[model samples]
Target chain A: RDRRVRVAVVFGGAISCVSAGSILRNLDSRRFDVIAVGITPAGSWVLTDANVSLPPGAGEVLESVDVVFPVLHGPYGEDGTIQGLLELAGVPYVGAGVLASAVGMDKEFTKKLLAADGLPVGAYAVLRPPRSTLHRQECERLGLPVFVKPARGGSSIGVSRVSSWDQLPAAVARARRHDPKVIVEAAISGRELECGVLEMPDGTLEASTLGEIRVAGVRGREDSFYDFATKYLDDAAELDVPAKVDDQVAEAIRQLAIRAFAAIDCRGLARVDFFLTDDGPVINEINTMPGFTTISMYPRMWAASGVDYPTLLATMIETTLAR
Target chain B: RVRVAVVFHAISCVSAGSILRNLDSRRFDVIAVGITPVLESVDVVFPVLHTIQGLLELAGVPYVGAGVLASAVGMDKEFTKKLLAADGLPVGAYAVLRPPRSTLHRQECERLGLPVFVKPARGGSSIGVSRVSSWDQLPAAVARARRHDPKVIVEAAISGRELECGVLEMPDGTLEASTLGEIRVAGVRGREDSFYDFATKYLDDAAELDVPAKVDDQVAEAIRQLAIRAFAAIDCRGLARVDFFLTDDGPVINEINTMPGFTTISMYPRMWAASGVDYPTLLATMIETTLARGVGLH
Candidate 1:
């Protein structure tokens, strides 16, 4: 007799149903007996509808799974905490390992590590608590307009664009509410581009076709400000797959994305975001477990590169099992 | 919620291995606290091991030492060096050899030069490490290092005195540096001068540790300052031991151990003791530091 390999799809943070049925709908039912586990915003583990919340020992369900696809988003999930549990649990999970996951979630650490590898990154100053003020040196170093946000994916929300000195305190205060440590980054003038990285079962790293994202009613800010409007975030699928750029620039962006993935020692998958400046492309940030929904740029980019949503999920799971 | 529970996981339970002896069952030493096991009913997440981050974080309880981010980063030497160097501290020269690339390329070997140290990037102990004095020995060193980790690091060995300094965060979140400690490797090839060479010290029983290291006051002060910066650079909480190589030029950060082995004789507590904090007091301070940290990402 043969038993199906169990795959536990653990999700939390805007994932009541693990980001709609798009991701969970594609698992090859014959090959995988998928189990649904959810963690609440209040930190309750559950045998979700994938809903509500269950008892604390609810993680015991993890003990029986062959593999885990933690579709978690911020902090506790993507910030390496869950990965730490997975490491100790002796289970194979998809996405980046503990170190990579941790580094990717912290904007400050991400830029530092990326820059250490000679990868181009924008200038930024980190404000760790008590010393949350934008010092004269930091302000001058990063120049005028800067994006102030939490060091790690701040609780749920915290980001501000400071174009003047008077706006500094308010921006700092708003960001500080979400996280004690804040990062003030100098805005870069460029187009928002993203490339998805997938590590195949054969251990070859592949970069998908690039995707471009733009915010409506934003022209001059398109090159500088990279933020999502509520409408774009909630429903608009306004992403340009095969992002129009010089063919050579596209190839270099793809190559740079792959190097960035390796630089973090990432596993399984990553989405490297960049700003294509006149000078060249400057890396913005990386997402270890990017949104897996069909409309998400990661899958959309890969889909444009000939890998469909089902094939993408299958490849990621197969890659984890192989490793 | 009413009683204090000492939470532990499989590794921690096995590590507390004195159960086979005369450590009683029903008459087990009772205190003001109670234990129900698992993390669910813990008072403050005091002393839990593999319950790790997700569990403690989800339960919304405060715990000890470094958090998941720092723990994972400090576990890897490459990340440790990057974070340290990024913070404006000095680190030794090294080239990373990620998998699919077995041995060092000819020209690439010339970059770091000979007399290098080959180490498995993520290895905690000296399980996969070799001191290479010749290029011919590199393949074996890489192969040995690969046995432990696919990612290997080849560093230009810094010839200097081995020193360590401990950084502890107090109850108020201010950091204090412990007196410096020096580890001298001896008995290599049965010679005294071998103590100066970079031998795999942890595996060897012939090493000596000197608390309040015999060095110039300036050297010790420099190292202590660097240790504090290294701890903060890694965003470590509770405590950490920053190891270094004190060359004639200055101190070069060797590594940072977030959760170092803490016996009564371990370097962390010993250095703290020599600096005026006793063993029991050191443990007390650590718990207080954990409590002060409360919970959530910080």
Candidate 2:
């Protein structure tokens, strides 16, 4: 047991902490010893082992681990702060590096990179602060049915889908409450498909079978789309593994998933979401370190493709070691 | 006394630590952490965050210069230019080449033009950089830069004097830009001075330092304005040395060094000194502002 690799699983955000718990339970015990560390929403580092002094022990705890699997989502956790801290600890870490993580966290830049790489992405406009001007011209350019979102937020927390131009101003205001920078994206009408990309042991990219998130009416949420409530609170979504797409479309999604992964310079793993339009698979966005609950789409897609939860966890660590 | 840590990730980065000698001891308690790179196996850069900023995040103390995002993006040449260009700031044309190379692609070379400067996407002091003036020279230049980082950037060489300006975050939360500075090759004349490569920069006396660089008031104002814009574009909090190429097309931003060299002779301080902010005041402002800002994950 002492000889096994020590894996420090760092988690933050309410949902992410649960994801971390699932990861701890699923990670193969034969090859690794796990230490669970939690970062409270207030930013306090809480160790599962013992209560120590505040502020200073986080680094010391990380230093003791052989590698860090940060199961953090959004803002402080996913947006490069923790990655920067991990980098300082000099420990090999799972998922994308700092640059990629920052870019992935910010929706505006994620679109900028995708568009720059000639990847298919929906047209979007960025609004910085004040939130006075409606950017009506940009709205006209993108057309109706736009989703105004906090540029730096995730999991559809502060997103508002505007069906009319009149609702645009209020939507932007709502997004600004969470983040000053707002991204107004023209909603693309298509099937919301997702694909998982992982780094293989020999340093190559692997794309898993496509997955689909279909919104089904559930007990709690009234949301017709995949919103925060539909995602975490209620069983309002049905996930289809190896999404019921034609082989050609599945291959196209897999290819685009790998391309999006490379475009962001992601390492370890990423979950690339796409809007499969009539033209082709348009990149919706990329999650550098996506949710990793045992039943999460990322792992479920891989499980359908042959690699189970324990093997996926082991491979993620091994890939980090290879790098 | 407010605690401030100065971190140097590489042994060659001792110049950053030189700020310690100039900092006022009465107001600040300083710690210098030198992170030596460990060779683990062949691929992994283990313990990647072996620096002050990374440790500072966990230490929960106010520190100098850029935070994690700014520092991380500033270190990456590709992202730095990307963010700058996205902000509608002018940057020279460039392309990134990942490892497992072929001969230089014609489309890229043609797009960036000849006399291109090849550089490691993430490095400093022009260590693994080369000037490729021809098609055949391109392959060797890419190979050279690839040694330092798998990712490499090839930029069109601009025909302009290299000008720089220092940007400091004032105590009252306003950004202050300094008078411009320029670097010149010591031996000049009919022979065109070589590009400011690694040796010319660090090999002592190969370059001449001109503070309050000999430029017209118009050009100076333009350089300073662009310097602050570049600094703000990166969301750099404390200080930065924004370098530019003063071409006929106006000042084209080259790069911003978030944790610029703080040696007594370093241009970041020299420019600020020329602007009447002495080294002690400059150091004190960095310390005071860091304390004022407090510290956390941000």
Candidate 3:
């Protein structure tokens, strides 16, 4: 007699499909019978149909599946849509719950929640459509080279660097393409860093050692500082995982990262990205559904912290089931 | 082609829709149009939507549109889903674009569909309607919906009976609905009134408003309770009419029109008149509701 472990893998698009496939390939297949659901255009059109073709419009029923492991990045799929859908369907899925995913997907809202929780955050103001003028007015008060980007988008899609007024409109327009609402951040002249956080079985928090990215060719590359292309496409970006830092700084970041997750009422996993400034560590952004590919810092940092990739995946699944 | 403009919101700002509708059909050719900042003269202010945009100036919640001819859309489409599940109107389908107590993102609303009308949470008729039938047409509709508001409603269409009952606004901030007025189909005559569609309604006479509304008191009070529910739902200030449909089971709410027709012959006044409140005070009462209620940000 054979006992089959039923597993469902949910991926949003191309990036997440790679991560999901890797999880499928690595997990002990002898014990698990796996099914995959693609929620994004790339994942649906390319991977899902090619690998496991679901019935037409059956994709809408994906969140209702018995169990799910979402490896989505960017909006809807990762932001909070799938999670909310699961809640409405009374189903459970891996990673953050609705409130956490919502706040995590929203950069400025998360920063405000963290700042209110006494965590250090860089100076930032939401650039609402009706009040875009007020945003520009605030930029002058913050000085030159402000970073403007969409408020709720992920992976630095519409980020832009502005040393002067001429670039504001173009940059704002770009940000508006992804989300009508945008946020402008005052550039903090500091080192870029990150920390990964996970939820233990007891529902307590664990934070990985801080990692600093040492950009060899693209230091402060543009006014937006770190744009999408630099973060995702180009290898010019380098990472020093388990970064060498004074014990005080590392502990502070680890503690703050967990606090930021708690502040936003997040569940499951998260990655808090920070900028080390002269004053202190200023939070730059947060990835609620952080990238999970082998190369992605969220999984890599946690993996380095003793939680292996397959175990991390299994742990999230178990927690989701408990929820 | 001469235009007949009936002043609905603006009149109830002074009179009411039925009174304006009653303005000698021979003399005025009524054309239903929307209210904007610099709106010019018109014969009829047809189907005022989301009166809360105007009533935001008022302090207390009120009553005011009933007649099947009045068509409408959403009031805090998202908020209604989470909040009004127990109310008279069976919930309609929609996607929530923002958190409660906040406006939705237009891009998100437009992404749902083009020409989706954004209405006032507390309004009636077509007051805060931004009707964007397509994505490219969204800007104007959104702009229209945004007038007199920060938070506008985006709604998908719900098909059912488009019935209404006019309740006269009392100074005490309560309502008195008259005999129900079922809207007979408006005959399309380019030669006559322009905006009243199959959904448009009118009273036979102010002097003689049929009571029990031709509907039994159960349906009448059901309409009344539903109207009260809608008034509370939008946090409306002063008089309003709660409109509901008669399907197989019972009443399903069609969005409330905040200020029903207030011209001398409007059904709201006549309904209250038949229910006991006279016409002159009905006019005076609506104005008083506006003045006494004051304004509320919440």
Candidate 4:
């Protein structure tokens, strides 16, 4: 028998575990009673109460929650699969709907929709399942120093930066290991900035202050690109809230982030990443359920913008309940 | 326990239940849920989660076919065309109208041209679809479609044979395309009711089905490839029937049915049966694939 607003913190995979930890730390315990449901790497379910215990069966732990905050990353969680179940459960959850989550998970489709909406996105090529290769001329047209990535994956897994012509096939193969479909984009040289969009309690969409990822060298170990390792494992990267971009460029990033979020019909919240080039802000991608670790950019951006970690969590759950 | 369930919400899609009835009882237990709450203790489900994919998703059950996003998008014609067109697949030009608040301007209608098809963006069985040949017929057609969904898609009619192809995931984790099929209406073309309307589809002898579609190898190959593309374009799994217009230019996709009719004699199963995969094999393959893929997190 729960008295407070029951919140189910659904966490799966490595990134989600980190996110769940942060959420539990920042949750307003006075207002919301939280239960942690952990999904193992193998996709099995377990419930972590005062004493961690595995649910006798799947979804049994979730049966009692009033609202669910799935702090999951990548395919199963952020890609609408979990959201589908949540919808069926008739329980309100945070972040985007099924369409937005699925579209956001797939890189090529996200770029396609954004590009069609006249958003500035870099030129890219798609390789569908069965893992076909693009023509040498098409590759040449995209120019060298391109990034090949799995079309429907996150966490920078199976992503590669190919500078030489000979590295194209291998890079695509690496991406194919993660997803059958691959997206090859002409590498854009610019500052990597991220903006957070949150659904206010009154159903208004608000864009948070921009955050920048300063990929610098850690000691002598210099990483040229922001790959999975640099992002998660290594402490080589630094993050700046209220990214040091000019007001015009910062506004452009904020506006494009909101537009990209709306383009995919995102609800709840999203973290739209952009490559701020000399021309302007070119859309990179949108994370429907961005990382929620206390230090994560999504919360960090909002934190800098006066919405602290606890308010961000409360706002997400409150917005969902309000809906 | 090897328990498999087939769930459906619409009575029209009850034909899919037959697949459960015909399942190999020696190997697995079968449950048939007709427009009702899902069952527990089911190992895998057919037609996956429908409008309730999200619900089943919460329960973390392994279900067959597309996930919630694909299923929802496949049901909406506007979103379907948008994803397909973005994927470099050929699709007829169409405009979306949010009615009551928005009007279907004559200029927009004229832009789509005559013989346009106005349909409820999210509807099954072509119930709210109408072919509008003149501007006078536009409002009524839109009104008819609006009865089904608030969003309506107005598409320019493409002149070509209405061809369809089936896509299913094989047990070995590869997507297979079925032989082509065509729908030929009994009456003359350009008439008010001559199009593939609800009656033409449901009424016996109103429409004739041509399996293998009598098309040349090039068109057949193109249709097969495009059907698979449409399936993957929406991230569909299990099975889907991709409808298209085989035009002089090429095959232009109409819309995809993620959980298309699946009786032994339905076009989707029939096409696969004609392609050397019988109904039982098709159903078994989908179940096996679901089992192998496990639930969600794909």
* TM per prediction: 0.82, 0.74, 0.49, 0.70
The stretch of ten residues in a row with the least summed lDDT in candidate 4 chain B is B190-199
Instruction: Order the numbered candidates by TM-score, best leading.
Output: 1, 2, 4, 3
In candidate 2, list every pair of residues with a backbone clash: A87-B48, A87-B49, A88-B49, A90-B47, A90-B48, A91-B47, A323-B44
TM-score of 2: 0.74
Query: How well does candidate 4 score on lDDT at residue B204?
Result: 62
Question: Where is model 1 more than 4 Å wrong at Cα?
Answer: A1-20, A23-65, A68-70, A73-89, A97-99, A154-156, A216-237, B1-55, B105-108, B134-137, B187-205
DockQ each: 0.44, 0.19, 0.02, 0.23
Name the candidate, 1 or 3, with the larger lDDT value: 1
Candidate 1 residues B170-217, lDDT tens each?
Answer: 998899999998887753321222112222463358677788889899
Give the Å error, residue A115, model 4.
3.9
Model 4 per-residue lDDT tens digits across residues B204-273: 6767788878889987997899888888877787888888776767678877888667667778878888
lDDT of 2 by residue, A222-323 (tens): 222343223534465677788899999799789888878877777878888787776767787788867687777788899999998889999989988877
Query: What lDDT score belongs to each candidate, Candidate 1 first?
Result: 0.73, 0.73, 0.56, 0.74
When just chain B is superposed on the true chain B, each candidate scores a TM-score of 0.80, 0.83, 0.48, 0.87
Q: Which candidate would rank higher by DockQ, 2 or 3? A: 2
Top DockQ model: 1
Fnat values, one per model, are 0.52, 0.15, 0.00, 0.33
Q: Name the lDDT value of residue A2 in candidate 1.
A: 57
Off by over 4 Å in 3: A1-5, A12-14, A29-32, A38-65, A73-81, A134-141, A165-174, A216-224, A227-232, B1-298
For each prediction, how big is the interface RMSD?
Answer: 2.0, 3.7, 15.1, 5.1
- Clashes by residue pair, model 1: A48-A51, A190-A223
